[PDB]
């Protein structure tokens, strides 16, 4: 009776009555002069403590109950409640201006949030989001009102609301909550990530859903194709019941693939790997039948520490992974901290444009006392599992020759000391610089393998920063220009008997896979949560047919042409 | 007897006795507490006025005597002497700290210069340079000492010194000054630009020249190949006398080319054009036998004004040029103000990385009320000369389709009003985005012509900012990656009967020309001062032979390989 399209954020088909997530009434008298200043201050302080304690409960029992690393967002919320930068100005305003806590809180929050959100930085945009969640909570206490939550208490419902706060999603009881649909939110948001973790169907960013649903209405959430249906007709209910069952069936046959090999209908093999940033992501990897690790981000090791990680710490983490993989490929990426990142412990110039300047291997070279410890640690850890090393931001040849020369320096350094190493350690490069693709066949002669970082490559090839909203529209992964460089790299590697993988998010995308297949892509690195689906898709395809499809795409004139070719190909 | 290599900054061979440019003794007692504060302040103020008047003489008679636009640097020096930001702190320091003017001047200057120089910005680096020149002058007055100058007074000398200040070079009397050689300085410095204007042989940045020469020594300056010779042997003198004469002969035969056509030995034509940023550069253009204008930078029109230029002003300037060219091609470039530029009158976000974000046609689109006036002005001016329009930073197709659609909007807007236009106006694009090269054959179908901006293309392809000294080494114009994109663009244009030009500095380079020839380059845009030399070189070459040379270059592995192939090709 009513179809509302949105962004699918979690697979599955949920069918239950609508539960409306009612929000607090945060209305209050502005500029109401307070009689008791110290009283008003204590009122605001009480709210802080009350919120602080509530968030400690949510946090600690979020982990131990569902991922010990997912509760990190809450550690980010509690931090906000401890930041003098944010609290002092509120207290100052109440004291000096005699403003009520409600107004002082609003004004200061609005000030900070506006500055951070109108700012081309991920971390800054993240803090604004957190400050939003906590201010609402704190304000709620101040006005003597309550936030929403999960206290049902029956029955099977579909949560309908504007947006689910990270605190709400962590409180969801999959026993009753069949799924949710909200006006706003993102496929990549923290709450929407906890969603697919709880395998709870969800579609997000619909804008209108809240105004389209009355409490008690039957709701179906098609997290498969991303559309919501309010008040289903008899025929629609019957049809989606079957779809929900097929979903469960597919889940079954999907688990019989965890140990199955990835082979196209016409005998062409591929390798499905997983991208990990922390050794806490290992469980998910083996569980999802991964053919190794194609991207191991080692920035998490260097970040958030007093001093840079010793060779020992590193060796410990590398050894652990190589073991956990029992001989399966592990591609470790040299330190590549984004020019626009933290690192509040290192010496680095402000640089007009960080994303073009001193970062990755550029930093690595000329800093061989901070880049070398990593290498000597990788060489000692190699005696365990199958190790691959690769350098980020290699734009030129003799850059690769210098780094490789540094590596062989250590293979000699350790040996003489008494340390044994493995003689088979592949050495490749992270392909993000367009220049490196332009000369692929030259690099292919010297490099053991390529792995494309679409995220970077797209920004450099099209010359636009995805962070800057002004030109973010130029983040076009299905752009023919990109496809051509991709193909160029792949062709070159096979010309030398090398292989090309892709550890950018595009590799795990169910719509970009058939193209990459047809281009000849050897390895697909993705989130472990997508490996099984990729294997199912690839095993049912013919490289021959996808080759012709790809050769039509590279000759398209716009991304719009490509996306349509793909969606309606015969 | 002594050969000192350096950077040639001006052609010619000068042979005369050494005149050493003696510098002032700026030594003084530091932290010498002053007795009379108001006296010391007036002492410093006197120096300011004395310098100010000296620089007004240098400035106004610099123009009217040699270019009315070259004296701009001095307008930049006088401005410094008027900047309260720089003066107040000196006066403040003398008053509060009782420091002598000499120390107060030194400390504040050192502070400002350090901050500006250690800063990845051209304008900021330019101000530091100016502050250096003026502080030295001002300090000179304060210490009761004199700066160097040109008061000879015989005879023919070669100026030897550490560096020539913009004030010294403008005082040079070509009647006596045969040429100069300095320890430091740049081929692109203002003073070194006035040098080639006065056709006075010069080599710069030798580091050692000052310590290698005694007053009165015979000096020969080979501004042709860039080496200095101190105390020439009898045989060397004889040989360089002949070289000086050949130089004069070559000058002669070079003027017989101003009206000659550019044609290779094997009948292959090319077009040598000139890059102009201001209509004051026209005289140089026609004088140097240019085949039109391949790059007309229109940023000088928008910059340094209260409000953006009306359609009228623009139409006036475009009409003037098109006339001055009597039917010769004029390629005008749409407004492209660098993200890291002034524009202290426009609304633009700070943006983390300007060089990737909101600039050129990106800005143009979404601002059709500030981009349209230019177009409607170009359409009305087209009825005069041969007009070509081209858009900067076009990374994608439908960007070009949108802009072209805007253009045709105006061709309709004017027509109905009563304004007549020319039906033949070519419309091409500035090729700086690597993505645009990757899809050249698609763009070639829709675009009338390509023109490569190496300056930008090199930075995007290799992903490094030339301004940032940390990664500036990646500004590699002879890199095989670049050559390949260049070739790719050229091939595509000819496949559609289009043409490709290059208005980057590389096009006018006597070492990059034979390569570009062999690549098939149709048009070469450069500084008018290089056109004649390019014609001489090209007219003496065979495209056939340079084709094979180019095809060996594109398959090189590094810039070092390419630069050597070129220098020692047979
Ligand atoms: Ca290099
Ligand atoms: Ca576009």
Swiss-Prot record, chains A, B:
Keywords in alphabetical order: Cytoplasm, Kinase, Magnesium, Metal-binding, Phosphotransferase system, Sugar transport, Transferase, Transport
Cofactor: Mg(2+)
Annotated Gene Ontology cellular component terms: cytoplasm
Catalytic activity as recorded in UniProt: L-histidyl-[protein] + phosphoenolpyruvate = N(pros)-phospho-L-histidyl-[protein] + pyruvate
Binding residues for phosphoenolpyruvate: 297, 333, 455-456, 466
Biological processes annotated in GO: phosphoenolpyruvate-dependent sugar phosphotransferase system
Protein name in UniProt: Phosphoenolpyruvate-protein phosphotransferase
Lineage of origin: Bacteria, Bacillati, Bacillota, Bacilli, Bacillales
């Amino acid at each position: 009776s009513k179809l509302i399209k949105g962004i699918a954020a979690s697979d599955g088909v949920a069918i239950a009555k609508a539960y409306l997530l009612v929000e607090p009434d945060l209305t209050f008298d502005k500029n109401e002069k307070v009689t008791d200043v110290e009283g008003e201050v204590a009122k605001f302080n009480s709210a802080i403590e009350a919120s602080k304690v509530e968030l400690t409960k949510i946090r600690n029992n979020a982990e131990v109950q569902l991922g010990a690393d997912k509760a990190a967002i809450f550690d980010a919320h509690l931090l906000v409640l401890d930041d003098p930068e944010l609290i002092q100005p509120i207290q100052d305003k109440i004291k000096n201006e005699n403003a009520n806590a409600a107004t002082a809180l609003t004004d200061v929050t609005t000030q900070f949030v506006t500055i951070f959100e109108s700012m081309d930085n991920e971390y800054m945009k993240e803090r604004a989001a957190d400050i939003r969640d906590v201010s609402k909570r704190v304000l709620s206490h101040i006005l003597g009102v309550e936030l929403p939550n999960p206290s049902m208490i029956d029955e099977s419902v579909v949560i309908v609301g504007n947006d689910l706060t990270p605190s709400d999603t962590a409180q969801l009881n999959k026993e009753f909550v069949q799924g949710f649909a909200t006006n706003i939110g993102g496929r990549t948001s923290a709450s929407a990530i906890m969603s697919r973790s709880l395998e709870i169907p969800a579609i997000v960013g619909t804008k209108s859903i809240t105004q389209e649903v009355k409490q008690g209405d039957m709701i179906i959430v098609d997290g498969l194709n991303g559309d919501v249906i309010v008040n289903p007709t008899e025929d629609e209910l019957i049809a989606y019941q079957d779809k929900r069952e097929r979903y469960f069936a597919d889940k079954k046959e999907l688990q019989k693939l965890r140990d199955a090999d990835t082979v196209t209908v016409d005998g062409v093999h591929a390798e499905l790997a997983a991208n990990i940033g922390t050794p806490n992501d290992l469980p998910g990897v083996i569980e999802n039948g991964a053919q190794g690790i194609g991207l191991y981000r080692t920035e998490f090791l260097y970040m958030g520490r007093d001093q840079m990680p010793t060779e020992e710490e590193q060796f410990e983490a590398y050894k652990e992974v190589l073991e956990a993989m029992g001989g399966k490929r592990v591609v470790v990426r040299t330190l590549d901290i984004g020019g626009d990142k933290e690192l509040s412990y290192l010496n680095l110039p402000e640089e007009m444009n960080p994303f073009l300047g001193y970062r990755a291997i550029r930093l690595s070279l000329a800093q061989q006392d901070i880049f070398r410890p990593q290498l000597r640690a990788l060489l000692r850890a190699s005696v365990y599992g199958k190790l691959n090393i690769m350098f980020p931001m290699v734009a030129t040849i003799n850059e690769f020759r210098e780094a490789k020369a540094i590596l062989l320096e250590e293979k000699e350094n350790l040996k003489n000391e008494g340390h044994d190493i493995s003689d088979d350690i592949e050495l490749g490069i992270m392909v993000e610089i367009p220049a490196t693709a332009a000369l692929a066949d030259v690099f292919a002669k010297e490099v053991d393998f390529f792995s494309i970082g679409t995220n970077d490559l797209i920004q450099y090839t099209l010359a636009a920063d995805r962070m800057s909203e002004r030109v973010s529209y130029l983040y076009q992964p299905y752009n023919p220009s990109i496809l051509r460089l991709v193909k160029q790299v792949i062709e070159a590697s096979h010309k030398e008997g090398k292989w090309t993988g892709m550890c950018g998010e595009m590799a795990g995308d169910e719509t970009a896979i058939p193209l990459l297949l047809g281009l000849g892509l050897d390895e697909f690195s993705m989130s472990a949560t997508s490996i099984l689906k990729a294997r199912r898709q690839i095993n049912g395809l013919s490289k021959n047919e996808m080759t012709e499809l790809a050769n039509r795409a590279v000759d398209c004139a716009t991304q719009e042409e490509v996306i349509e070719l793909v969606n309606n190909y015969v």
